[PDB]
Design a protein around this ligand. Structure first.
Ligand SMILES: C[C@H]1CCC[C@H]([C@@H](O)[C@H]2Cc3cc(O)cc(O)c3C(=O)O2)O1
Ligand SMILES: C[C@H]1CCC[C@H]([C@@H](O)[C@H]2Cc3cc(O)cc(O)c3C(=O)O2)O1
Ligand SMILES: N[C@@H](CCCC[NH3+])C(=O)O
Ligand SMILES: N[C@@H](CCCC[NH3+])C(=O)O
Lengths: 487, 493
């Protein structure tokens, strides 16, 4: 129960009373557990290196007292594990009683060990202590793999999940590898990383409810950024012709399996590129990234959890491209002619939503009626592969340059994995005359377009969602170290 | 004035009605401007690679007097420059009149050029167009090479700064070089980059007023992080023995030349490492970083502004160590007995602050008294070198492990450059029983129960360190204000 904790705290006070520091300041270790394994894994069975005295540290993860002269424990560090073989025969008896100094060690204790390496006669690579010191006690009962199988403990006490579940450390290692590969991918291509503000006086770049904070000495209400689109574009005007940023953005919407209020975004902007270059970049990056982590272009994904059969997702280029409005017309046998904000085709879209009894949008604007229609008729079309939804209308793309041969549409692209959007990119609207919302968006951004924004392609990445599909997770809370929870 | 912008706006429309598109979708370029300079810099004076046709782009920054058969321009891109030599005999007349094409070009316009590389017989590398297309026009008149010193322009319109002032691009490139160097420094030594929340229900890890904001659908009031200290330490408990984060933190206080309400910090945590390990890391990193940027350990810095003689800052290790209480005692010729919140020690700390004509802190705490005495008597001791103020009292360091031989003090260190703090680090307090806030004074203090609970699972002996990335950028780019190293500093409209 909880009496374990109170007894362990009383033990700490008992050691403080006896003149023992249960939290020593420094322990100088000679080697780490992974280095220990690679250095000695090819020892012979039963072999000892009793002349090699090492200092090792780790966390005791299992205790077993066979008889009363041999003590076995599991010592873990950095995700790897070795055994510790405390033999009374090799104990330094001037520095303490053998039995009393090993009876105190509990599961979860951080310890420092002075001893030699070797292998048990069965062949288990072990550390052989002459002396073991408590470094930091685990006062609570450390749970085993049961208990952390599916609770909020993994999300509220992530440290427990990292210690107990081998899967999760590999998961967050993979997330760091993904961001690393992306940063180098762009840097190798001449892109320049920058920091744009997170607090601004308007929130543009996309359209979602923002966070409201107040600056005290400026006496001003500021908005957490919903995207990095606008200031990055101004840098393109500033002559930084290949610029990008990886960081958190904040959208005050609803929490679900693919939405966290703060999430990690990557937006790059690429002068003198168009959406044809953006599609090529998307295909190159995702295929090269998937191969970099798996040595193959095909991966497995448990789309409906580990209790259902998984599907295979081939990342070999090229990916299919599906024009949104044309595909809605093919699936519905409807012809939604322009304008799209017509009451005539707002009526037609509503009747399709009514016929199939799809969710009706909050404000039934054409931009969101088109959204809901694609969400129900295109977005889950391809599951064996990633695919693009391209050539969005202009009333859905206020910042995307108009299509050069298709009136009313933009040169936009979104890439979907298993029906989840992980990418948004388009040829950038750069004619200040045509951004008719300049006379929400900033006036600072509009006047910068008046100084000359070159032809530009821009692309945004949802890093958390890509991590999910590459770590085989169904919820975005499994790829964020401390997801935001309700207390 | 607005007449110039209105003229360009009508010109743009006039081209659209004549059939030309002043904003074409895509122009496929063959080579960049730096690549152009690198590939053709060493040609003879007068060379003409007429058969080698290329597609180059850039921004027109100088329009020379029309010679009626030759037109000269300055083309810039990526902070480098080449000359545009439009010759009438090389013009492709199948696509428009020569004079009418180039008369439209204004300074600031972004153009696409089909031409061949060559050198003027004076030594100037040039591009020789046969066709120039407007890619996107500059509708305002740009300032000139030395007419952008009103810096509420440079801060509010950073794109104009980056175009006109050569030093501005160099300053922000150096900032990225700094952060890249820091990331690879930590990654080379086994450290692991992570991301912690920017929004929490408590704001701990420092002593500062926080930004508060509301999550609408969740109906909760959250606090922006003032530091990454607490969740990173919880990751050490999780067994990530070398962990760090480079990102923004938010502190709702006053703005000056060294304070911006949002600023970039980097905190790392290092299991089984202590104060002594952190001292050498600081010396290794700063000395290696400065040498990496400059090829030397000494730099020049205008601590009194660009109008005054600068000083030399030597980053040659080792740097001096000054223990704050001992030095306050030596400079003021007084001895401050313990405890420090003693009423006689408070009294004599107050009498010193008033014998030396010093501002009295708003809450006359024992810690804030030791704060002000430090800044007036120590923090400007050395100006030619970085140096450490060390061994802070525990009443100023609520998360630093108690000094192992000096009761009342911690194993804490702060590094100062020219009086400004850039580094903060200490041996981590890992005894949950000694964290007095897990079972303070009734404004900018303190704790988190999730953090206290994680401590009860065993935080190993750890050293952690925090770097103020922006202030370090200031000293290495010779800037006096933090606004010179932030691309878009937060400002008042
Ligand atoms: C930057 C963008 C480019 C396209 C791909 C991806 C979006 O689909 C984003 C939308 C979104 C909203 C939200 O409120 C909370 C979220 O976690 C997400 C998300 O993870 O993904 O990132
Ligand atoms: C992470 C810390 C530890 C190392 C030194 C440095 C602090 O001195 C920080 C204090 C601070 C407060 C503030 O409200 C606004 C600011 O821009 C800064 C700042 O730049 O530096 O970074
Ligand atoms: N701001 C976009 C990403 C960039 C799209 C291209 N400008 C988004 O939030 O989806
Ligand atoms: N988080 C602290 C730095 C402590 C360094 C070790 N955690 C700060 O903002 O000053």
């Amino acid at each position: 129960p909880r009496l374990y904790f109170e007894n362990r705290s009383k033990f700490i006070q008992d050691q403080k009373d006896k003149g023992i520091n249960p939290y020593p300041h420094k322990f100088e270790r000679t080697i780490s557990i992974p280095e220990f394994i690679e250095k000695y894994k090819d020892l012979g069975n039963g072999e000892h290196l009793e002349d090699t005295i090492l200092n090792i540290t780790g966390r005791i993860m299992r205790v077993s007292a066979s008889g009363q002269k041999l003590r076995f424990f599991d010592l873990v560090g950095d995700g790897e594990k070795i055994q510790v073989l405390a033999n009374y025969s090799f104990h330094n008896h001037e520095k303490g009683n053998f039995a009393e100094c090993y009876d105190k060690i509990r599961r979860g204790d951080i310890v420092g060990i002075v001893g030699f390496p070797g292998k048990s006669k069965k062949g288990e690579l072990s550390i052989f202590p002459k002396e073991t010191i408590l470094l930091s006690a685990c006062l609570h009962m450390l749970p085993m793999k049961y208990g952390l199988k599916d609770t909020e403990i993994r999300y509220r006490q992530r440290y427990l999940d990292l210690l107990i579940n081998e899967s999760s450390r590999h998961t967050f290692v993979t997330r760091t590898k993904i961001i690393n590969f992306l940063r180098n991918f762009l840097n190798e291509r001449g892109f320049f990383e920058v920091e744009t503000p997170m607090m601004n006086l308007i929130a543009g770049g996309a359209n979602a409810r923002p966070f409201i904070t107040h600056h005290n000495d400026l006496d001003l209400d500021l908005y957490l950024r919903i995207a990095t689109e606008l200031p990055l574009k101004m840098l393109i005007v500033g002559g930084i012709d290949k610029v990008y940023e990886i960081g958190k953005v904040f959208r005050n919407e609803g929490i679900d399996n693919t939405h966290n209020p703060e999430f990690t975004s990557c937006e790059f902007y690429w002068a003198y590129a168009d959406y044809n270059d953006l599609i090529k970049w998307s295909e190159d990056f995702f295929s090269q990234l998937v191969y970099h982590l798996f040595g193959t272009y095909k991966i497995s994904y448990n789309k409906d959890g580990p209790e259902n059969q998984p599907i295979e997702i081939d990342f070999t280029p090229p990916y299919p491209k599906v024009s949104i409005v044309e595909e809605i017309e093919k699936v519905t046998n409807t012809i939604l002619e322009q304008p799209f904000d017509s009451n005539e085709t707002i009526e037609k879209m509503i009747n399709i939503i009514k016929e199939h009894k799809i969710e009706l949008p909050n404000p039934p604007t054409a931009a969101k009626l088109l959204d809901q229609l694609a969400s129900h008729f295109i977005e889950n079309k391809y599951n064996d592969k990633p695919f693009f939804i391209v050539e969005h209308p202009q009333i859905m793309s206020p910042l995307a340059k108009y299509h050069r041969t298709k009136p009313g549409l933009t040169e936009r692209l979104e890439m979907f994995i298993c029906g989840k959007e992980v990418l948004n990119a388009y040829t950038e609207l750069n004619d200040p005359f045509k951004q008719k919302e300049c006379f929400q968006l900033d006036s600072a951004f509009c006047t910068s377009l008046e100084y000359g924004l070159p032809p530009t392609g821009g692309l945004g990445l949802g890093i958390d969602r890509i991590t999910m599909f590459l770590t085989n997770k169904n919820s975005i809370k499994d790829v964020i170290l401390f997801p935001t929870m309700r207390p």
